[PDB]
Coordinates of C-alpha atoms and ligand atoms in Angstrom, one line a residue:
X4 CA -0.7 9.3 29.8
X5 CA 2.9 8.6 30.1
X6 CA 4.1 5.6 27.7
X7 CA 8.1 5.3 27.2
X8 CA 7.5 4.7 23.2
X9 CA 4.7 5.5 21.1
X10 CA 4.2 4.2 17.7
X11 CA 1.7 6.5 15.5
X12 CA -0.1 3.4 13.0
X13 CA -0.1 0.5 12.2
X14 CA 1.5 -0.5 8.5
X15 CA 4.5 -1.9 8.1
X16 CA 7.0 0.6 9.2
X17 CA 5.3 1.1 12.5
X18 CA 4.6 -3.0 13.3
X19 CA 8.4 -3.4 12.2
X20 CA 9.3 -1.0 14.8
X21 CA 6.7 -1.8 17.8
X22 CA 8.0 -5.6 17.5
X23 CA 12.0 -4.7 17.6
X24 CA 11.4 -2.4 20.6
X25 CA 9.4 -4.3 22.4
X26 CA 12.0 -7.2 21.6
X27 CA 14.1 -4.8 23.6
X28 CA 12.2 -4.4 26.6
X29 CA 10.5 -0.8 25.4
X30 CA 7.4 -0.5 26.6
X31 CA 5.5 0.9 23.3
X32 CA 1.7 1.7 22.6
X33 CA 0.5 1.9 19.0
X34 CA -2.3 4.2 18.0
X35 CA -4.1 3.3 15.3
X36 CA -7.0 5.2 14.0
X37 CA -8.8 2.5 12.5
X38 CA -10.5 -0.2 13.6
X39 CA -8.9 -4.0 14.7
X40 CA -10.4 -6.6 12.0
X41 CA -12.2 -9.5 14.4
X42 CA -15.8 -9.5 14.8
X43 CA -18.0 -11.2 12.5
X44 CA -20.2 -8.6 10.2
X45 CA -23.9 -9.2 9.3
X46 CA -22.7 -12.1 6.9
X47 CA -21.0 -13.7 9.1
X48 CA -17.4 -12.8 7.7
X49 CA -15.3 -10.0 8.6
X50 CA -14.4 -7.5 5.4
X51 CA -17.0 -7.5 2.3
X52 CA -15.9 -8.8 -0.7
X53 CA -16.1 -6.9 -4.3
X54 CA -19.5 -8.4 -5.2
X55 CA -21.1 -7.5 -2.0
X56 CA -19.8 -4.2 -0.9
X57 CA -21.1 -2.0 2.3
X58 CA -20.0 0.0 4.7
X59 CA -17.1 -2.3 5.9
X60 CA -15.5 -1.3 2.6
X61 CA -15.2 2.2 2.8
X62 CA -13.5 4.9 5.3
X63 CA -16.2 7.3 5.8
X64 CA -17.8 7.7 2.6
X65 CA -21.5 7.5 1.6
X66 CA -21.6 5.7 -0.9
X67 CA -19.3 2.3 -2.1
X68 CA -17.1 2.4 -5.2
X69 CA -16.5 0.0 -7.7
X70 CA -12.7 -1.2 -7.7
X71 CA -10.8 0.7 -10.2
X72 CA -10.8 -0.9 -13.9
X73 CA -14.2 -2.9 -13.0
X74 CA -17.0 -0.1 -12.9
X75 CA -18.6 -1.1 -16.0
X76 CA -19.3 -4.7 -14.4
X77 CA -19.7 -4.2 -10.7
X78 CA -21.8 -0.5 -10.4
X79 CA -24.8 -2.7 -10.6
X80 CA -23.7 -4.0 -7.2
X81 CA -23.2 -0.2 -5.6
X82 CA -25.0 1.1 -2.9
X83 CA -25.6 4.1 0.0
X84 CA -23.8 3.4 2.8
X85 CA -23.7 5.1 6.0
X86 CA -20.4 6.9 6.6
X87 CA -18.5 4.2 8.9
X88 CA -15.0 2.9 9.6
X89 CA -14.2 1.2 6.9
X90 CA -11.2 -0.6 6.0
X91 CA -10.4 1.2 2.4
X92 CA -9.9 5.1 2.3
X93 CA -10.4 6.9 -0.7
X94 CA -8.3 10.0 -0.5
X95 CA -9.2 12.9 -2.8
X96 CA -6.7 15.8 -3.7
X97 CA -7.1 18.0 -6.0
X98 CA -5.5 15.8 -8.7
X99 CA -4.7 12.7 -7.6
X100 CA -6.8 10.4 -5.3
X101 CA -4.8 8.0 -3.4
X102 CA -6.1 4.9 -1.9
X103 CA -5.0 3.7 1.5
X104 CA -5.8 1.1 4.5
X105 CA -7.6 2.1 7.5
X106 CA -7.1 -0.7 10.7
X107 CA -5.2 -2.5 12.4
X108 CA -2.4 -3.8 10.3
X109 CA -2.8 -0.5 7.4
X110 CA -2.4 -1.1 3.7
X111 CA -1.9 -4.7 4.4
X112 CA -5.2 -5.2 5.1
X113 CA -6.5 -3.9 1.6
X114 CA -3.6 -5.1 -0.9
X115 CA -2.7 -7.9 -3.4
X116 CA -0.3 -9.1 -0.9
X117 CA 2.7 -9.1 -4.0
X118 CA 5.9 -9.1 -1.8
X119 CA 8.6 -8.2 -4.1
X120 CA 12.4 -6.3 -3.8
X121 CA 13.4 -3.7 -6.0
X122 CA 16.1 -4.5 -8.2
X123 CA 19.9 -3.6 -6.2
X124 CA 20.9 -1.3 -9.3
X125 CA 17.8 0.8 -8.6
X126 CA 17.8 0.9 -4.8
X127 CA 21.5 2.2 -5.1
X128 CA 20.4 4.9 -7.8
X129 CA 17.7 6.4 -5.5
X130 CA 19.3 5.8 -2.3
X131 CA 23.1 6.6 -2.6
X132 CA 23.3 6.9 0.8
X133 CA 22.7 3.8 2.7
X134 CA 24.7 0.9 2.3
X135 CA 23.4 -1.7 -0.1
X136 CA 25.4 -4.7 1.1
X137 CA 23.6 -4.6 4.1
X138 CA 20.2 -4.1 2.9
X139 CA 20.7 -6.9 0.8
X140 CA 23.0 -9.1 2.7
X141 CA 20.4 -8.4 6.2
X142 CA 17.1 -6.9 6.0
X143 CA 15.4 -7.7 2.8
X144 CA 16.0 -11.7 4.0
X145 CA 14.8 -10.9 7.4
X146 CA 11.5 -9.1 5.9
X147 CA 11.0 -11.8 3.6
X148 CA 10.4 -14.5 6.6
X149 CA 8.9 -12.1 8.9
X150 CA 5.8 -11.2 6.5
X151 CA 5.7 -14.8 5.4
X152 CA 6.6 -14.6 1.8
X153 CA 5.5 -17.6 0.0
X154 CA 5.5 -18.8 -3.8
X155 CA 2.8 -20.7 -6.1
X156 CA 3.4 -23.7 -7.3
X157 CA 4.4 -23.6 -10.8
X158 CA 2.1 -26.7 -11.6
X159 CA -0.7 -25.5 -10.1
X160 CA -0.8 -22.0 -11.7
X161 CA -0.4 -23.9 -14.7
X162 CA -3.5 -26.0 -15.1
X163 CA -5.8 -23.9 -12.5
X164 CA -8.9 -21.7 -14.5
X165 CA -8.4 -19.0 -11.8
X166 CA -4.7 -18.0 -13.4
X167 CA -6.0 -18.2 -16.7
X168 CA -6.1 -14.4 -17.5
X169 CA -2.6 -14.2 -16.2
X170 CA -1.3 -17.0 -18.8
X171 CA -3.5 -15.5 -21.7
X172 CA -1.4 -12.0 -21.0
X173 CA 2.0 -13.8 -20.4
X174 CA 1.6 -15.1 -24.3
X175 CA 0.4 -11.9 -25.6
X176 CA 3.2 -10.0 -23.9
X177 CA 6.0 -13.2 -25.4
X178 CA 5.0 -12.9 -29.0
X179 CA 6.1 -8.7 -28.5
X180 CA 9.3 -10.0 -27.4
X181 CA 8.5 -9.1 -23.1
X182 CA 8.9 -11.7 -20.3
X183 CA 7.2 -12.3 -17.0
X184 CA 7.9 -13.1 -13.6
X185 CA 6.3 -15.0 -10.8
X186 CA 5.5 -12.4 -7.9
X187 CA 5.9 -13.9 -4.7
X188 CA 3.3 -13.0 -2.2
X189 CA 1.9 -13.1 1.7
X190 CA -1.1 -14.8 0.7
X191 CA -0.9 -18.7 1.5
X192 CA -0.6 -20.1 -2.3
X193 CA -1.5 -23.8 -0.5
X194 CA -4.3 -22.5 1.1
X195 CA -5.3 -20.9 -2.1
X196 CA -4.8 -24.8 -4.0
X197 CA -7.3 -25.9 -1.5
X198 CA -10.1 -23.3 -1.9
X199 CA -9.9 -24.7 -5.7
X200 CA -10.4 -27.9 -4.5
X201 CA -13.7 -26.6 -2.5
X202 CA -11.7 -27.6 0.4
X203 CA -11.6 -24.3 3.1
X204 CA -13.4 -21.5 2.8
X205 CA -13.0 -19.2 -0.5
X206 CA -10.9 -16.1 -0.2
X207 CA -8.8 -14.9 -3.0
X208 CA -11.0 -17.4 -5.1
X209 CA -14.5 -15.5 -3.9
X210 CA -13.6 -12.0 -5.0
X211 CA -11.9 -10.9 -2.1
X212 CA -9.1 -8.7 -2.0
X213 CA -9.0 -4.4 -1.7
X214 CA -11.4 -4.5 1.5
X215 CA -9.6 -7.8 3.0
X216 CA -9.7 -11.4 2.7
X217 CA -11.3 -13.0 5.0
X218 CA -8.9 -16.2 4.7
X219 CA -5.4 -16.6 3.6
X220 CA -3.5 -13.4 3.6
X221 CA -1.2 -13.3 5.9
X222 CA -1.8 -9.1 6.8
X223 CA 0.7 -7.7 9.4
X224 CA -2.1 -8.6 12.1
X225 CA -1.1 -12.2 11.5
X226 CA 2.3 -11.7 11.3
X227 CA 4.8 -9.1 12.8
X228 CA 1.9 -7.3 15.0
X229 CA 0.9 -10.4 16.6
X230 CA 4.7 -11.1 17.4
X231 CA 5.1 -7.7 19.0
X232 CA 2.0 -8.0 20.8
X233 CA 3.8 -11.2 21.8
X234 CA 6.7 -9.9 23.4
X235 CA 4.7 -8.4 26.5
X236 CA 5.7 -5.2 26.2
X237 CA 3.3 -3.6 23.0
X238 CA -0.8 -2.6 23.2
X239 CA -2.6 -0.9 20.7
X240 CA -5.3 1.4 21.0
X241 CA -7.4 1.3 18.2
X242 CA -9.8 4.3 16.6
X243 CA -7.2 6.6 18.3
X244 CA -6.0 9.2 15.4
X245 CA -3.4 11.5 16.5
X246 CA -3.7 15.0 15.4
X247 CA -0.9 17.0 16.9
X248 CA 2.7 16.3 18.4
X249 CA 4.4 19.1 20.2
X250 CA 8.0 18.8 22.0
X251 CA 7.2 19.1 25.5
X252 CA 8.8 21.3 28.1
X253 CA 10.6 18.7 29.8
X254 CA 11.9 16.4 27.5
X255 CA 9.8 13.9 24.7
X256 CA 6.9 14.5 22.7
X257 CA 3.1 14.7 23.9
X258 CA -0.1 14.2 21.7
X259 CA -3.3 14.9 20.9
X260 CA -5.3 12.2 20.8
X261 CA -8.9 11.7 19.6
X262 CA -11.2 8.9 20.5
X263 CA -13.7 7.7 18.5
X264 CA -16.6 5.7 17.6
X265 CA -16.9 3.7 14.2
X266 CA -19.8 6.4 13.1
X267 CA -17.1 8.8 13.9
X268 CA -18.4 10.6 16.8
X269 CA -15.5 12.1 19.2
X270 CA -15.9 10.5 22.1
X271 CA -12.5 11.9 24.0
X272 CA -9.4 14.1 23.5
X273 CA -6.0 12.5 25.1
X274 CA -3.0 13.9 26.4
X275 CA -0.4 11.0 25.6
X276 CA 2.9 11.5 25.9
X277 CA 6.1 9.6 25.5
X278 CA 9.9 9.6 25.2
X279 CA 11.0 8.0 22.2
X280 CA 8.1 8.7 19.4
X281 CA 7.8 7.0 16.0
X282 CA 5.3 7.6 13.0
X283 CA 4.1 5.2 10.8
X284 CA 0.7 6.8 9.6
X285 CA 2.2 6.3 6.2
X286 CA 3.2 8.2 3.4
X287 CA -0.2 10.4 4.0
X288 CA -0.3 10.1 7.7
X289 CA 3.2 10.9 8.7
X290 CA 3.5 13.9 6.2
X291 CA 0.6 15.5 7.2
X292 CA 1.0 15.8 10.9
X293 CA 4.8 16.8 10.6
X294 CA 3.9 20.0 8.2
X295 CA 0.9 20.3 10.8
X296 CA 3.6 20.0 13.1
X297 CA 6.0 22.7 11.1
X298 CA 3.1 25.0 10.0
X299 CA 1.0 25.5 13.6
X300 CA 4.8 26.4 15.5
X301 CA 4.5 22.9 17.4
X302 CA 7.8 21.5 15.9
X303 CA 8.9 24.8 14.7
X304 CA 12.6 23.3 14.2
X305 CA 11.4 20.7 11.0
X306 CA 13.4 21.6 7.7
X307 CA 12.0 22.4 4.6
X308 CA 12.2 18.9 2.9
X309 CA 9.2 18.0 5.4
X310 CA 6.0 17.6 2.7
X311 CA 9.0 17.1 -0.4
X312 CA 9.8 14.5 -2.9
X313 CA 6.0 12.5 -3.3
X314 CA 5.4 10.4 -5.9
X315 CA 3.0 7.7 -7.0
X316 CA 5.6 4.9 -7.9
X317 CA 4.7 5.7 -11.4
X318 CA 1.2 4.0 -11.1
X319 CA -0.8 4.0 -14.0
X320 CA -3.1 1.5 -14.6
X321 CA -4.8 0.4 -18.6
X322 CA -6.1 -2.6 -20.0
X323 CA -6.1 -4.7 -23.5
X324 CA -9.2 -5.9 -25.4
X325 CA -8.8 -9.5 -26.3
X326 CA -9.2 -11.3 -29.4
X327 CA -12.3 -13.3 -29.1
X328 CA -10.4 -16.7 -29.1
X329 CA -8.2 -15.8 -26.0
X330 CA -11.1 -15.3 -23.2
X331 CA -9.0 -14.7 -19.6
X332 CA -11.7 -16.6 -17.8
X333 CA -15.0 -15.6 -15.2
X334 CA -12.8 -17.1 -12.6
X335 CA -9.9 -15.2 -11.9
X336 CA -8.6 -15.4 -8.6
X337 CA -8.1 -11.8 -6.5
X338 CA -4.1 -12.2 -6.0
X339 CA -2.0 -11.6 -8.6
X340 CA 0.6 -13.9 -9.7
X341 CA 2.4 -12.6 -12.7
X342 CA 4.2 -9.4 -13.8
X343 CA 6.0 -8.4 -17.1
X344 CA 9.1 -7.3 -16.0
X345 CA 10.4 -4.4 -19.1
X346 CA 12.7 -2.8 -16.0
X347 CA 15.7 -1.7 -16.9
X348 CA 16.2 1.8 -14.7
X349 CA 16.2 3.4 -17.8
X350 CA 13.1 5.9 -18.9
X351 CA 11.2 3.8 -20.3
X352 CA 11.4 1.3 -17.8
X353 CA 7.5 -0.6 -16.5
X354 CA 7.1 -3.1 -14.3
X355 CA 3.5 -4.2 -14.6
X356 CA 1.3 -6.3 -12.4
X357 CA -1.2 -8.8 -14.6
X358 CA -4.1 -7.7 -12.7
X359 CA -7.0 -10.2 -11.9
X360 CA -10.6 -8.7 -12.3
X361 CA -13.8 -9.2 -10.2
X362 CA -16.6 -9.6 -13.1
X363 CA -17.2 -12.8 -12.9
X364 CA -18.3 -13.3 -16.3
X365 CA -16.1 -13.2 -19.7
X366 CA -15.6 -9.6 -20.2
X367 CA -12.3 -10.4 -22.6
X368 CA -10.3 -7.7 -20.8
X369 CA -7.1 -7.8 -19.8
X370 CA -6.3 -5.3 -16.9
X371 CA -2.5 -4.0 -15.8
X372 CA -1.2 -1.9 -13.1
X373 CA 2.1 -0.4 -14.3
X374 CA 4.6 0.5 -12.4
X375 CA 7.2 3.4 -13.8
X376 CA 10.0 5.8 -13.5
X377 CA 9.0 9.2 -14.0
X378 CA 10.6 11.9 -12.4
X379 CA 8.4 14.3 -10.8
X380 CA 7.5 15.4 -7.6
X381 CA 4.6 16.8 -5.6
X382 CA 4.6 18.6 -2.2
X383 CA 2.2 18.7 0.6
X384 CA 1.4 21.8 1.6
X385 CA -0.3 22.8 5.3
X386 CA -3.7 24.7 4.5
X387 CA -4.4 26.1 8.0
X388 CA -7.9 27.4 7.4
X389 CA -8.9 23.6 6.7
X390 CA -6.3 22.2 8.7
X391 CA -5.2 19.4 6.3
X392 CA -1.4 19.1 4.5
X393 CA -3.1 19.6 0.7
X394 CA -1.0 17.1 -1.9
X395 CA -0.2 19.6 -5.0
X396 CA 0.3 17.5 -7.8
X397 CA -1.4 17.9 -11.1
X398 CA -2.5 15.1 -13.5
X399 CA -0.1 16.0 -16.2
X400 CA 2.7 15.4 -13.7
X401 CA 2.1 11.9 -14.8
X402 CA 2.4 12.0 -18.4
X403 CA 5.6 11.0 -18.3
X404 CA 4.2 7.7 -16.9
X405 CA 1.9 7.4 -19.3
X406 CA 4.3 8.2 -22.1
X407 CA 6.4 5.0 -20.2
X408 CA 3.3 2.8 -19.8
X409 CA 1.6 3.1 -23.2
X410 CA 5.1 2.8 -25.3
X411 CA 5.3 -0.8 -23.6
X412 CA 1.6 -1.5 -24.5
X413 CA 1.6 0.0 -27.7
X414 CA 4.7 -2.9 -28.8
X415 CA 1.9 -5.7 -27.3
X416 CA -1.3 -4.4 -29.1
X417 CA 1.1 -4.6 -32.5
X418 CA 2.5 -7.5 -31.9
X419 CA -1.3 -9.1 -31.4
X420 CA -3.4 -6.9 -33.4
X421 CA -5.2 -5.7 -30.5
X422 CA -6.4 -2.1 -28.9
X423 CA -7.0 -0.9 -25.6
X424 CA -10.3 -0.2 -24.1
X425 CA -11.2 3.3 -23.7
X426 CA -14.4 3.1 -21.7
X427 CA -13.2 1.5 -17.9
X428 CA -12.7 4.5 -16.4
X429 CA -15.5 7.0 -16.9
X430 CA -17.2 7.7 -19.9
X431 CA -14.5 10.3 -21.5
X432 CA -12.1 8.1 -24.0
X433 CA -9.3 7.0 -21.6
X434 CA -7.0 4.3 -22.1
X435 CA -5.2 5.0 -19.1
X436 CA -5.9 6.4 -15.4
X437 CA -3.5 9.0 -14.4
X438 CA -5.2 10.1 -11.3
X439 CA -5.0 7.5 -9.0
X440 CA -2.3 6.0 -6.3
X441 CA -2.2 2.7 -4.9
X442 CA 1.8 3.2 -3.7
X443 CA 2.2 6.6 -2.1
X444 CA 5.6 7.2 -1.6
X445 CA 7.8 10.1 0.0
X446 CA 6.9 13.3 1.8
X447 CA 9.7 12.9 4.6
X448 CA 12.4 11.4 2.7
X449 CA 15.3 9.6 3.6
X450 CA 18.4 11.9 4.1
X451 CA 16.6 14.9 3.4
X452 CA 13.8 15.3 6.4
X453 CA 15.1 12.9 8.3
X454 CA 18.9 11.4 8.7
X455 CA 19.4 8.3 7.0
X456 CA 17.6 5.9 9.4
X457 CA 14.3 8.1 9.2
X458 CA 16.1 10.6 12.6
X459 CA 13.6 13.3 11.9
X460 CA 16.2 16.7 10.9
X461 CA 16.0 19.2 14.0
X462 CA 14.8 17.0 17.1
X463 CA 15.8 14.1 19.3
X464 CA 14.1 10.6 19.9
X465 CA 11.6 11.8 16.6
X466 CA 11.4 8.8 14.1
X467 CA 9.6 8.1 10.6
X468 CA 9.3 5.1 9.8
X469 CA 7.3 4.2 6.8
X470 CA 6.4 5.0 2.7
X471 CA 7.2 8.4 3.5
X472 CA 11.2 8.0 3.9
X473 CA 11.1 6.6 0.0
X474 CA 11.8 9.2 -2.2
X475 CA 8.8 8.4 -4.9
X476 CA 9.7 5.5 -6.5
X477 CA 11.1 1.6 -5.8
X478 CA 10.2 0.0 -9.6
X479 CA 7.8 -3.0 -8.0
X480 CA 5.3 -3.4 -5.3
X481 CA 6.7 -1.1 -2.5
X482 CA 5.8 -2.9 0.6
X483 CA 9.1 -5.2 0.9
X484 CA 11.2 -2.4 0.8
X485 CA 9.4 -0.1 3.3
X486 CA 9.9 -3.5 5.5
X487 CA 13.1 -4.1 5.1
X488 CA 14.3 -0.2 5.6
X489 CA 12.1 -0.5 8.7
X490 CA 14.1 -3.0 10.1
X491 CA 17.5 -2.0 9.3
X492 CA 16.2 1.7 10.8
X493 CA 14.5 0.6 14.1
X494 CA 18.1 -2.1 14.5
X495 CA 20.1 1.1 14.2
X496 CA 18.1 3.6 16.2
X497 CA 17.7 0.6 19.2
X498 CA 21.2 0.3 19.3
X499 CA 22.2 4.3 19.3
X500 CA 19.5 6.2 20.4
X501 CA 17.4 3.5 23.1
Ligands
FAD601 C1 -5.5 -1.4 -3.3 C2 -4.0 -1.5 -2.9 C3 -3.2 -2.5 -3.4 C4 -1.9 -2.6 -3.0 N1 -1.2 -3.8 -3.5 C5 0.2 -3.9 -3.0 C6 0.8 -5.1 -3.2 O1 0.3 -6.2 -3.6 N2 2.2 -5.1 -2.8 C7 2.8 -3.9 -2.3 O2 4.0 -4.1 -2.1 N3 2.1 -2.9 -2.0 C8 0.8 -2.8 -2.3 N4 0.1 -1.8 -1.9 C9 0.8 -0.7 -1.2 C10 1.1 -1.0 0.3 O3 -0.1 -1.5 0.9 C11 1.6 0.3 1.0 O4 2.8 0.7 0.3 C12 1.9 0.0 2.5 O5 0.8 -0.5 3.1 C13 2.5 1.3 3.1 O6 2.9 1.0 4.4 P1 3.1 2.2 5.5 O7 3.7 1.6 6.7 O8 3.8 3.3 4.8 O9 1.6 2.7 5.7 P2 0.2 2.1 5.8 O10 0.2 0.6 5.5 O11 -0.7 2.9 4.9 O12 -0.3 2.2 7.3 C14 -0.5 3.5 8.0 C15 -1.5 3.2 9.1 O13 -1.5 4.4 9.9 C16 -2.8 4.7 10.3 N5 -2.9 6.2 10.5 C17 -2.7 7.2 9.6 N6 -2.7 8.4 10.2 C18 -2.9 8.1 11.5 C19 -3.0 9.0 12.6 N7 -2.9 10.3 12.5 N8 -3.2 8.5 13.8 C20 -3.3 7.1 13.9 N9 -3.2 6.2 13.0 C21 -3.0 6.8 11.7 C22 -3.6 4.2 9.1 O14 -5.0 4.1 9.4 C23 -2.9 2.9 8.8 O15 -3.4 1.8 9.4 C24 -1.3 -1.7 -2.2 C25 -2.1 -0.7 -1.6 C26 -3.5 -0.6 -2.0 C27 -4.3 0.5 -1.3

């Protein structure tokens, strides 16, 4: 049926949204096509953890995957699986593979939680258009309370064993001359003192993280989608994917709607339609139904920039053998807490996570997810005969990023006397993946599909909300900023359009 506002997902831009209009008096239903994390698995606990995989883990695949970096360590623990609705989706182009959440609350299910703005000098290169001052004077302090950005205790970090790999990198990365940064973060660092202290239940401290923690992290469940829920005037509809949007005769959208069980069997087709309608399927999601949309003559007025301007966030991810004397520990907890900030906007510019890994015994590896500025672009392109928007980026797209990532590197291994490893990532000599996402961003960008608060180019009452609008890069963690825009859009589009 008839809903005045319909909000396609469940990640940040979309909960953003749902919670302002419904603070409005909009009556708004969110259609998410994952499942809503709450019942107790065969364990006992919600999500799997790394050690333990099965099918909770994995959207629809047959088999579970070792987190990226650890294979060598936790294969052993693989298994079949049957294909389920799973909380982590694996999804394959052609030469990229991009890794996204699938549930109630979307990526912030699945990530490391690192809540972090992008540097003002950076967001007013790519972004010309929108006004800084109120970006930075409004809605990145009203996203940081919303999500429930906390900060660890500088003690603490200090003297615990689960931070040592992070304070073994941050003095290999000081005697080449680089500095870190604390990386502030949803997960509750008190709660995460305690499970130390073998006081409440292990989370981040058990090898939780990519397929959810089953304490402590403060997902957008928790947080702005329980508010909006809150306000009376939001439902969700869970395992409800939305595969076409058409303009309908007399005014608004309508939708195709699928219903589904969590083997994936169809169990209905829905008609829903709506007045004001809003996607927040993500960078992925929200691409791929508007050059569906474009492509199959249902929204036959979209511009040209609809599938344009994707990028990675310059992800790239590599690692450093230790010396033998500087171990990083067999307890490392799953949230990150420290970065090495070598961001300057220029070329060579990395931001890089010091990432925690899941072994649980010495391994003498230290792992890094960098963050870079490189500038090219992919598009997503409709294939009709398979009816999927096809991502056409090719691997040495990112050498750029590589160049970026290993020239930082390269100044730490001389400064220490240390190498990579070349053996994490399959069996071919690779220092560092190329091929992988973590922080899709762009597709429907800002200003170019879309006005500049996300007013989809050619219709009325058509929003995007979410990693799409960024044009492919923000130089940290992205999810802050795809909050904050979210907020500042949905203010703007409440008080003009609504
Ligand atoms: C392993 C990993 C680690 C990460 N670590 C960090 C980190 O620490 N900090 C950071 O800032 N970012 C991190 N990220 C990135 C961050 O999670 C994303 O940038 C963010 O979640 C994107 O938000 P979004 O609103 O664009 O979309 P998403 O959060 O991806 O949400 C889209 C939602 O829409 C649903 N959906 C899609 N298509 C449809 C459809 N057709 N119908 C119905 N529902 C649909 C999806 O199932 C999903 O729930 C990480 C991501 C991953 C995968």
């Amino acid at each position: 049926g008839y809903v005045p506002a319909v909000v396609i997902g469940t990640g940040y831009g979309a909960a953003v949204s749902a919670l302002r209009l419904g603070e409005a008096g909009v009556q708004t239903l969110m259609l998410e096509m994952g499942q809503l994390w709450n019942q107790p698995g065969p364990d006992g606990n919600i999500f799997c953890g790394m050690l333990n995989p099965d099918k909770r883990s994995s959207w629809f695949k047959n088999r579970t995957e070792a987190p990226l970096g650890s294979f060598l360590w936790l294969d052993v623990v693989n298994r079949n699986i049957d294909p389920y609705a799973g909380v982590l989706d694996r999804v394959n182009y052609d030469q990229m593979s991009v890794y996204v959440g699938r549930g109630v609350g979307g990526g912030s299910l699945v990530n490391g939680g690192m809540a972090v703005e992008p540097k003002r000098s950076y967001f007013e290169e790519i972004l010309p258009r929108v006004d800084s001052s109120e970006m930075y004077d409004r809605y990145f302090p009203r996203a940081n309370s919303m999500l429930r950005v906390n900060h660890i205790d500088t003690k603490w970090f200090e003297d615990t064993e689960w931070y040592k790999f992070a304070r073994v990198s941050r003095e290999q990365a000081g005697k080449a001359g680089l500095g870190t940064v604390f990386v502030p973060n949803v997960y509750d660092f008190g709660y995460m003192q305690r499970e130390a202290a073998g006081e409440v239940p292990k989370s981040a401290l058990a090898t939780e993280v990519i397929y959810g923690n089953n304490h402590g992290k403060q997902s957008l469940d928790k947080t702005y989608l329980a508010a909006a829920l809150g306000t009376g005037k939001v439902t969700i509809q869970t395992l409800h994917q939305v595969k076409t949007i058409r303009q309908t005769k007399d005014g608004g959208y309508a939708l195709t709607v699928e219903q589904k069980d969590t083997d994936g069997k169809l169990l209905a087709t829905k008609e829903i339609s709506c007045r004001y309608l809003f996607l927040g399927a993500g960078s992925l999601g929200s691409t791929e139904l508007l050059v569906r949309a474009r492509d199959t003559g249902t929204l036959p007025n979209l511009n040209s920039e609809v599938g344009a301007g994707w990028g990675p966030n310059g992800n790239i991810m590599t690692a450093r053998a230790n010396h033998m004397w500087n171990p990083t520990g067999a307890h490392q907890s799953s949230i990150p807490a420290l970065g090495i900030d070598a961001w300057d906007n220029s070329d060579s510019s990395v931001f890089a996570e010091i990432a925690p890994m899941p072994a649980g015994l010495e391994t003498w590896v230290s792992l890094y997810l960098a963050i870079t500025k490189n500038p090219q672009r992919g598009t997503f392109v409709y294939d009709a005969a398979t009816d999927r928007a096809k991502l056409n980026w090719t691997r040495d797209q990112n050498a750029p990023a590589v160049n970026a990532a290993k020239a930082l590197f390269d100044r730490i291994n001389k400064a220490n006397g240390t190498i990579y490893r070349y053996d994490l990532f399959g069996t071919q000599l690779k220092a560092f993946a190329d091929d992988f996402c973590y922080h899709p961003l762009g597709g429907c960008v800002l200003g170019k599909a879309t006005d500049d608060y996300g007013r989809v180019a050619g219709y009325k009452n058509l929003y995007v909300t979410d990693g799409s609008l960024i044009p492919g890069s923000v130089g940290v963690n992205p999810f802050v900023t795809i909050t904050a825009l979210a907020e500042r859009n949905v203010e703007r589009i409440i008080k003009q359009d609504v």
